Design a protein around this ligand. Structure first.
Ligand SMILES: *[C@@H]1O[C@H](CO)[C@@H](O[C@@H]2O[C@H](CO)[C@@H](O[C@@H]3O[C@H](CO)[C@@H](O)[C@H](O[C@H]4O[C@H](CO)[C@@H](O)[C@H](O)[C@@H]4O)[C@@H]3O)[C@H](O)[C@H]2NC(C)=O)[C@H](O)[C@H]1NC(C)=O
Ligand SMILES: *[C@@H]1O[C@H](CO)[C@@H](O[C@@H]2O[C@H](CO)[C@@H](O)[C@H](O)[C@H]2NC(C)=O)[C@H](O)[C@H]1NC(C)=O
Ligand SMILES: *[C@@H]1O[C@H](CO)[C@@H](O[C@@H]2O[C@H](CO)[C@@H](O)[C@H](O)[C@H]2NC(C)=O)[C@H](O)[C@H]1NC(C)=O
Ligand SMILES: *[C@@H]1O[C@H](CO)[C@@H](O[C@@H]2O[C@H](CO)[C@@H](O)[C@H](O)[C@H]2NC(C)=O)[C@H](O)[C@H]1NC(C)=O
Ligand code: NAG
Ligand code: NAG
Ligand code: NAG
Lengths: 119, 108, 50, 52
């Protein structure tokens, strides 16, 4: 399994964020996929978690603007958060759960990450 | 960030360092889903302790977890010159909601 | 006691009646339930994992 | 001992008035092969008795 993350450069204060990490050697189904974020100084706050056929979860402090989804044909996952502010600029990782496929407690696999500085 | 940790810790080679992670009763005392991560400054974190007292395959068995009441403790025994990394604690707060900690930078 | 009956297992009628009764019980339990014959269409199939 | 490691999900589809078709949604976790286990020594003894 390989998680390759992508996001567009620097974002405007009112333009929304679109984040996508393609999966390699995986089904993008039957596995919980989660997003975690850390500011440059310190971080590791988790944004959201998704599953194909089970109930997702969202961060209460960011539940307002989290609209995340998955695509099975192209094997991708999209954060697509909006209403961004200059104070949330940070680097993002996407991760998936263990081989069990039903646990979103710990995330063994991770990804490279993206800068996504807010202008 | 409900869960908090001491800002840093230090020691000497061949010694043991204990790191404490605290939270409310509803957070940590609800279930056993407590995890610890380490990350290098230039790399992504990796799981070191999952489910409080279990460890992933292919890692050194020099780490542990105690679940002392509503507080968790991680002990590192026989640390070396390359075991200097940040340590984060995460726990489940119901409805598949995780809460992280402030991290503990261990230097030697 | 004092009796010796001549048995044969390859020519008894219990097996035939059991076979036809099992077949009949199998058949009568498939009458009420759904008849899947709109499913004969042209399917389009792909691999489940890649 | 026979086993089917896959963790399936069944999905119901309505094809008419009062008619339901039960498809398969997906599989949670890893896709693994179904298989059966027998003990070697006991089978060896049984085959020896059968040969005798
Ligand atoms: C088994 O195969 C089936 C059939 O391919 C597959 O179901 C299909 O999944 C895709 C992707 O999830 C669905 O396509 C989407 O449908 C919605 C609703 O109509 C559209 O809005 C989507 O288009 C938008 O979103 C895309 C991704 O963000 C954008 O790229 C696009 O430009 C649009 O903005 C998209 O087309 C499709 O509808 C289903 N089909 C059915 C019949 O359900 C299923 O996931 C496969 N399962 C497994 C386990 O492999
Ligand atoms: C197959 O997947 C299902 C999830 O759809 C698992 O069901 C969970 O099982 C655990 C273990 O007892 C329960 O705590 C959960 O409440 C169940 N439901 C969920 C998570 O929605 C099931 O355990 C899996 N099968 C195996 C053998 O692991
Ligand atoms: C049936 O036999 C197989 C083969 O020995 C068993 O699979 C083993 O399971 C253990 C426990 O998870 C693994 O450590 C081994 O690596 C597995 N063997 C192989 C070859 O991969 C299985 O547990 C047995 N019992 C069943 C299927 O019920
Ligand atoms: C097939 O499954 C049975 C039942 O799970 C296994 O029997 C177990 O055997 C171990 C010792 O080998 C005992 O400690 C367990 O108590 C047994 N199970 C039960 C429920 O009593 C058996 O080992 C399996 N494998 C075979 C038969 O090859
Ligand atoms: C027939 O059965 C009776 C009743 O057990 C027994 O007393 C008698 O000895 C048997 N006949 C012979 C020839 O053994
Ligand atoms: C799908 O499976 C077929 C049959 O094994 C294989 O030939 C093909 O390369 C696979 N991948 C596709 C069609 O993308
Ligand atoms: C069965 O066991 C006997 C004695 O242990 C041995 O000689 C024989 O080779 C075995 N059969 C097989 C197929 O291994």
């Amino acid at each position: 399994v390989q998680l390759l993350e992508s996001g567009p450069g620097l974002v405007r204060p009112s333009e929304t964020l679109t984040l996508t990490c393609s999966v390699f050697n995986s089904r993008v189904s039957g596995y919980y996929y989660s997003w975690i974020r850390q500011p440059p100084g310190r971080g590791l706050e988790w944004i959201a978690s998704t599953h194909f056929s089970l109930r997702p979860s969202r961060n209460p402090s960011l539940l307002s603007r989290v609209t995340t989804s998955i695509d099975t044909e192209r094997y991708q996952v999209f954060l697509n958060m909006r209403s961004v502010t200059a104070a949330d600029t940070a680097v993002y990782f996407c991760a998936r759960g263990d081989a069990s496929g039903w646990r979103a407690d710990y995330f063994p696999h991770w990804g490279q990450g993206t800068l996504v500085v807010v202008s | 960030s409900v869960l908090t940790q001491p800002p840093s810790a230090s020691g000497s080679p061949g010694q043991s360092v204990t790191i404490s992670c605290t939270g409310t009763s509803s957070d940590i005392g609800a279930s056993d889903y407590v995890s610890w991560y380490q990350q290098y400054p230039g790399e992504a974190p990796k799981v070191i302790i999952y489910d409080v007292t279990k460890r992933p395959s292919g890692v050194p068995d020099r780490f542990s977890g105690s679940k002392s009441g509503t507080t968790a403790s991680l002990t590192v025994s026989g640390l070396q010159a390359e075991d200097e990394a940040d340590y984060y604690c995460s726990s489940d707060a119901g409805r598949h909601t995780l809460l992280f900690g402030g991290g503990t930078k261990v230097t030697v | 006691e004092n009796v010796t009956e001549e048995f044969n297992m390859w020519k008894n009628n219990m097996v035939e009646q059991m076979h036809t009764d099992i077949i009949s019980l199998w058949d009568q339990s498939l009458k009420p339930c759904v008849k899947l014959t709109p499913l004969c269409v042209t399917l389009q199939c792909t691999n489940v994992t890649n | 001992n026979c086993t089917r490691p896959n963790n399936n999900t069944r999905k119901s589809i309505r094809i008419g008035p009062g008619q339901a078709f039960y498809a398969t949604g997906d599989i949670i976790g890893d896709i693994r092969q179904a298989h059966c286990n027998v003990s070697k020594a006991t089978w060896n003894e049984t085959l020896g008795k059968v040969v005798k």
